[PDB]
Design a protein around this ligand. Sequence first.
Ligand code: 200
Ligand code: MN
Lengths: 159, 266, 157, 785
Amino acid sequence: IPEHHPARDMWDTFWLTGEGFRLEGPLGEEVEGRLLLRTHTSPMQVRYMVAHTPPFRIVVPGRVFRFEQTDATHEAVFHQLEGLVVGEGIAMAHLKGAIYELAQALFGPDSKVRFQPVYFPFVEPGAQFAVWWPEGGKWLELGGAGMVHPKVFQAVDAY
Amino acid sequence: RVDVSLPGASLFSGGLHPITLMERELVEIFRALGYQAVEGPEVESEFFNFDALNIPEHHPARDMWDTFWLTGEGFRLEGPLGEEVEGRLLLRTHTSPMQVRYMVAHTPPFRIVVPGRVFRFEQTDATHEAVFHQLEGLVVGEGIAMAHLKGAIYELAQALFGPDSKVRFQPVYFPFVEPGAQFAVWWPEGGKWLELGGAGMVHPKVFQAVDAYRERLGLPPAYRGVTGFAFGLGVERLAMLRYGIPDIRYFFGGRLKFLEQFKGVL
Amino acid sequence: IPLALPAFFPAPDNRGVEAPYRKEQRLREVLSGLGFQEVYTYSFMDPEDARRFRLDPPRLLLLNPLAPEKAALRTHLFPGLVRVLKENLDLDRPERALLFEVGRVFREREETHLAGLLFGEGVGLPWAKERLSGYFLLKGYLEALFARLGLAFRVEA
Amino acid sequence: MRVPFSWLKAYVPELESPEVLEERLAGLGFETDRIERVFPIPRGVVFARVLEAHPIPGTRLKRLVLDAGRTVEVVSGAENARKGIGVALALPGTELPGLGQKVGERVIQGVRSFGMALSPRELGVGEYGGGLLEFPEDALPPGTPLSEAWPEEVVLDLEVTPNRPDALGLLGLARDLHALGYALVEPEAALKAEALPLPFALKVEDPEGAPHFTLGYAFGLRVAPSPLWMQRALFAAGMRPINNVVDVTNYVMLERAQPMHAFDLRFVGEGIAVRRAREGERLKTLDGVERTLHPEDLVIAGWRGEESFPLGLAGVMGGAESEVREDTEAIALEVACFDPVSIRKTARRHGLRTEASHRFERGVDPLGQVPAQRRALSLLQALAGARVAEALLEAGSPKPPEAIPFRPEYANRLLGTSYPEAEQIAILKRLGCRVEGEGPTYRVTPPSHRLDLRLEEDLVEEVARIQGYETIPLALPAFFPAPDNRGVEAPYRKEQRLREVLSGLGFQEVYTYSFMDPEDARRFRLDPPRLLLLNPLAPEKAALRTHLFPGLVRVLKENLDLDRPERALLFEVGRVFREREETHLAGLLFGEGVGLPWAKERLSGYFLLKGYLEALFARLGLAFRVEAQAFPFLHPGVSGRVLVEGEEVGFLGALHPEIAQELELPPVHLFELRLPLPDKPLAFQDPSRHPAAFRDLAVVVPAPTPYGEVEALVREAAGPYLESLALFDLYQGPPLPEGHKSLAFHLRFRHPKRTLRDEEVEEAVSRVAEALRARGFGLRGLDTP
Ligand SMILES: N[C@@H](Cc1ccc(Cl)cc1)C(=O)O
Ligand SMILES: [Mn+2]
């Protein structure tokens, strides 16, 4: 997700300033770059990957920040839950099974998932998924997903 | 001005029993592998504790469990589907009967782990009890093989003793499995093989018992074209090794100076 | 025999099958966090305690007990707790004690019981004197428990 | 993007319905946020011809004589109301959406207006209400109901993600639908060009900004209203028709994500120059807004002799002066590909977001210009009777897209699907891709319009979406996780237990914003916040919190103001910032305390918390200790640091009074620690079977001496056989030497192997009494029963 990229507009960033602050990288080392409040937990899947080796399954919860107007169903400070499963032979059929399991566990046997193609610079194929909520009887758009992007793996190994 | 280093209100501080901690850790280990924990009744029927598991009377194999036989009426022992079953009452000699109860009450595939207090008529010494705990495992489903039982235990070990741990399987006998086996895990620190529990591929006759009982209850057969593995391990012997307890008799001793020592642990 | 891990979608009737077990675990955990100390006591019972502690007679008995003091199956959880209390006063000499135990009890049907016991001076300042204890100390601790469990608690005489 | 069903249906004829369409676009990757039916026109509205316009003397109104089958008069105040155009005539009795009330025959300034001529807003087809709808005078037979040539339309409000800029063109959308299997109809640009020179030149002085730039030449123009079908189309798409030429350029833009603009040749001069703007340069843009250009703005300019003047803001919005109007006869047609970043910055710089900038920012087909010129010129020839030149003026020569290696096997492996090879290659071909070779790995080169297709993965998603994400089966992976991943969750699990034990002990969890008010740094007496926000939501949230307790003290007040809690025992775990980002645990007490509701004696304040905290660590099996130490934000009398397992991890005490006062709060007690707390490994201590030795003794010490030091010495000196040691009574006064106090200690001894002989005990009780006085402390009562 580079600068001046139309895709970077998907996240309204809070930019930070001030010195003396030590931001530490994945392997405990002291990294650099323009500081900001993370706009999503996603950066963590890069940190984890440079610090471990596949195969593996992780879920990373976390407080995220976005410059936005606070209303009844919108916050500037909220929480996300990332998921990342890497390994030889991992396919999109597995992403779909995971979410299927998520739904069942969250809404019962009469629940069901739905996947539609959507865009994200860090995945390809990319997708958005919704789960069927039997009680309220409607599709809840839960989150986005997809197969990790080639360039993300390259970034990890380069680092 | 106040002596802030002065003791504060003596609000009580609680704690969990060693077995609870051990059982918990075990249950977590397997939850991560997709196993769900369910329990069974401590008072059982000879049918569930023995017969259903391919362990008949006057059988040399039934001597592997010294049974506590119960008596008295008015007691209602309830079966898997909540129904009121019969048979000679006894204190379960192992958690195994529960894998029969669960199977007549559900359908494959599935993964369960069942912890539980078990009883055996035996002389109580420093490393032997008449009242202890086991943890059963049962994974049934189409295509389940012994390679999976071995992988489960491998995972159990890693989770319990680190990357330098390793498992070992030797053929051993149990009327409810075939192939049958005993497994030991390598304990790097103490540097020795700990015999943990027995296991094996569920026995054909156990599946038949389940489906037969199902018919008798009006349910349709569910274990005709599936295989599966089960395992069982003693909890105290492991809790002792793990928490460094010298005498197994402490667990049921009820001594606070003993119990209080485990508040920290998790 | 190689090592492997199985993959499969568990059959529907197996969902949340662990709820019960998980429910009781939280209970034990909240208790230990509230201040109660867990204790494990043998499932056996001394037929005499039926008379001692004033209880109806034990329904299940052992055809082959380890001893006559362990010839029956417990009907209540509190008698074993009252006992461990004495035994603790005899070996060591605890000034106080706030215990709890969860266990299977037998009578008509096998059922799971939760029992707790208080004893001693109480809550207050070690160097002071005013203290909180007795009935209302427990009743209070119990009020917190259910407050924590989001359940209505009430004690009628 | 607005997607008018009937318009799209022109390229994709076999479309089932707007509902089925919404469905198809969803599966293709386009979500519709709304579907609307839009042009209800009552029978009362008919097409009319303005035979003549006559201004009413003394008024700024006009008497229109209309041919509406029969001749009728109507009064209008619209500036564009003139003879020679067709209008929408709402006859008396017509129920118009835009007014609510019924239209009728009424007298205005001396003339009987037989109904009225409508504006886009009155007919309800557009928001524009500053003039009459202008139709071609011959659009219809006078008096025919307008519905008969302007049916209702259904419009989908489509989301078009940045990766699919080709979808910002209705034909682009059509192509995706084609890939699904629908027949595709592409418009034929029937042009009758004339080989002759273009009366102007092109000089692209900045190829960075204008990588590919073409110019078309159309003359002999007969500017006039657009056909009814185009106005309907444009209106449905959110735009407003202007006339022949201008409409054709919006139509084509909406059709193929290719903004274009017609410059009236009257203003071009010798030629068009694509250059950067000279500082200060002015330009009155089409929105009537007078602007001032920044030297970084790409501009479409013209020149005459030694003068260069701006004509439009390249790729964003054209100039007001060169705009094509009724008297225009010839134009220079701009169809280009601009540098996305440049357009992006310029657009922002001037606060402009246009149909054009939007598409150039997202990217345009690097080789679509020439095809776009034909489409436009063709349409201009058909609707404005344009005579078009055969040649174009071109500058730039983009390279075609490169081949991408594609393996049907990888596609299936990545998805977990099993689509037969042939099926895949066909899909790709339908999307306009070229497929060479015969596998297993192919050479797939995409259409220049697909900027989003560069990697093999990009191609496998094409196969997936056209096959349908629903055809991907469900599965669960199995594998032994790599070694370095073991117990990787310990940390997270550790903090969770902590929160849980706290909630079980009595603490109520609270979440407080990670932000901070720079002033509270002063208010709560803290060093200044190290990290600040370049763009805060407000100045009260301009910094990042350094402590967790200030937010807690605040929530307390806010809770006393809304509701009126008698007590409160809170806690919060959160990330704090200062030098390094660290996790903190903070708690706050307040109110009367613990006791009997109907009674009076109570337990509260410092020692209530200190006690609750003692339980916590008791539960965590960790050493807890509170030694006195000062803290700006704490009460000087009720203040001390925290020592978990020896090391200092935070503080505990009463909120400094002055702060309490400035905040108008009762005494508030609290603490804040640094996580993760230490880990004390178990070392089972086998209990002793034998009895323990019980002995008491008081220690006389000055009031100033901390209990901690006394206890420390007593224990330290009590010997290796000490079991317990508890303060059961603190006293001071008569008969002790005032300024002193006695500490009642309960002591125990015990030997693991055997019992203890009175010699060992009474001697050890001396080893203490010894160093007890040798340290300067008394012994109110030794060997006390
Ligand atoms: N429950 C058995 C141990 C066991 C053996 C084999 C299996 Cl498959 C499971 C459990 C016992 O009490 O010895
Ligand atoms: Mn794509």
